[PDB]
């Protein structure tokens, strides 16, 4: 019952760093092929602040679920890269779990995130969630955790 | 260029870092839906300036820097929308290059050779990527190391 979503507004130096190592390793694992994408999963032209407050949670969760799904596919396919994603992925689960435990126009975007693991290559998706990772944790997440004072 | 003054680049500024950060974000977005990646790594995480002796680190940083500062210059010409974001960063990037030059006159030779031979071995999509992912490390860790001389072990 005692949820405290306002905790995710802040994140922390420890988490941030552990995520950076993940990103630094991922990007480093993306450089050796292959080609990427043919569409954009997370355009810098769109933003969670577009929807109404009550809808932003479901978008974030979806976003999370996808980026969680892909980084799991990667963690498996590359054991060495899995050692740097192990804890970050765990924290990523904790965030989403807490999200759905405390929540109780957005379908042109949602439906699109459905046509992703079936319309894009693994490398593409991996690059997508990787570049978007930091925006998810610090910006998008912060936005939802802040409710009515996120405009 | 009227002396050696790079200590001003040790901590940089939250101002500039934001401009580079948004620049890095825009760069990555362009990379998503375009010409693939590299066949080899230009900036291996295993490779570090601290491995070199203090007197040769500035040179290595110089090579690392000019490479990215070129690939970016090219990008800002091919994709002008990106150039409005890369604009100010590049000026700073040049400024540190200029200041750096005024400070100067085995494992090193090979590294600055793969970088010097890079623009004609890897794809433009590969280049724009290697220097983007290495951007931050260069501005914070690598640059700072050269500005710290002996005190960077």
Q: Which of B33, B35, B130 sits opposite A38 (nearest CB)?
A: B33
Cβ separation B130–A31 shorter than 8 A: yes
Which two three-digit tokens encode residue B141? 């860790």
Residues B129 and A31 sit within 8 Å (Cβ to Cβ)? yes
Which two three-digit tokens encode residue B35? 């010409």
Dihedral sign for Cα atoms in the order A20, A21, A24, A27: negative
User: Which of residues 41 through 60 in chain A touch B, CB cutoff 8 A?
Assistant: 43-44
Domains identified in chain A, total number: 1
B134 at the A interface (CB within 8 A)? no
Closest-CA distance of chain A to residue B127, Å: 10
Which two three-digit tokens encode residue A13? 């130096």
Q: Which of A34, A127, A135 sits opposite B32 (nearest CB)?
A: A127
Closest-CA distance of chain A to residue B135, Å: 11
Q: Give the integer Cα–Cα distance in Å for A23 and A17.
A: 10
Beta bridge partners of A32: B38
Search chain A and give the residue with CA nearest B23.
Answer: A44
Q: Give the integer Cα–Cα distance in Å for B108 and B62.
A: 12
> Taking CA B144 as the corner, what is the angle to CA B140 and CA B147, rounded to the nearest 5 degrees?
155
Specify the DSSP element, H or E, that contains B6. Answer: none
What's the domain range around A124?
Answer: 1-151
Which two three-digit tokens encode residue B53? 């002796």
- Domain with residue A31: its CATH number is 1.20.1250.60
Contacts A24 to B, Cβ<8 Å: 45, 133, 137
Residues A59 and A51 sit within 8 Å (Cβ to Cβ)? yes
> Taking CA B49 as the corner, what is the angle to CA B47 and CA B53, rounded to the nearest 5 degrees?
125
B31 at the A interface (CB within 8 A)? yes
Resolution (A): 2.8
In the A/B pair of chains, how many CB contacts fall below 8 A? 57
């Amino acid at each position: 019952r005692g949820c405290h979503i306002a905790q995710f507004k802040s994140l922390s130096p420890q988490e941030l760093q552990a995520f950076k190592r993940a990103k630094d390793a991922l990007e480093e694992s993306l450089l050796l092929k292959d080609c990427k994408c043919r569409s954009r999963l997370f355009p810098r032209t769109w933003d969670l602040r577009q929807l109404q407050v009550r809808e932003r949670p479901v978008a974030l969760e979806a976003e999370l679920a996808l980026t969680l799904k892909v980084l799991e596919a990667t963690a498996d396919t590359d054991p060495a890269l899995g050692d740097v994603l192990d804890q970050p992925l765990h924290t990523l689960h904790h965030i989403l779990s807490q999200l759905r435990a405390c929540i109780q126009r957005l379908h042109h975007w949602l439906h699109r995130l459905q046509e992703a693991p079936k319309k894009e290559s693994p490398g593409c998706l991996e690059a997508s969630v990787t570049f978007n990772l930091f925006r998810l944790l610090t910006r998008d997440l912060n936005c939802v955790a802040s409710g009515d004072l996120c405009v």
